[PDB]
Amino acid sequence: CTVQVRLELGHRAQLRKKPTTEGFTHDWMVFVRGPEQCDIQHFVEKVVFWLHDSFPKPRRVCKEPPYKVEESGYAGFIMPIEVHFKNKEEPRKVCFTYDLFLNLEGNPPVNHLRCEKLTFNNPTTEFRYKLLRAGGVMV
């Protein structure tokens, strides 16, 4: 069998009304989630968000939903996002590279959505069940 599951990556950003003491101009939020009706927790062990080295403790882990990071900053950047699976064999994880871009002052808030598709060939019985409970479909 071959099982396909959908992931949704996305982010929001907007100008703060008041810059922080550090000079951070924006609030933003990044997320990994399933499409409507899909609880990806069935097959996702954790999501690791790799922030820019300019952030303290840049490696941010969510072991359970919502898989997200809420932060404040002054600039956008490329954010590796690793999704780890509740799997006993390969693939154990997948790494997306996510563009966390901010809006320029005067322009509308960012509200970006990105749909990803994962294909698993011949998963174990145990892992197949997890994928199907998360809204996976055989292909």
Partner: peptide
């Protein structure tokens, strides 16, 4: 929109 410099 400002972005964090790579170099």
């Amino acid at each position: 929109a400002p972005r964090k410099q790579l170099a």
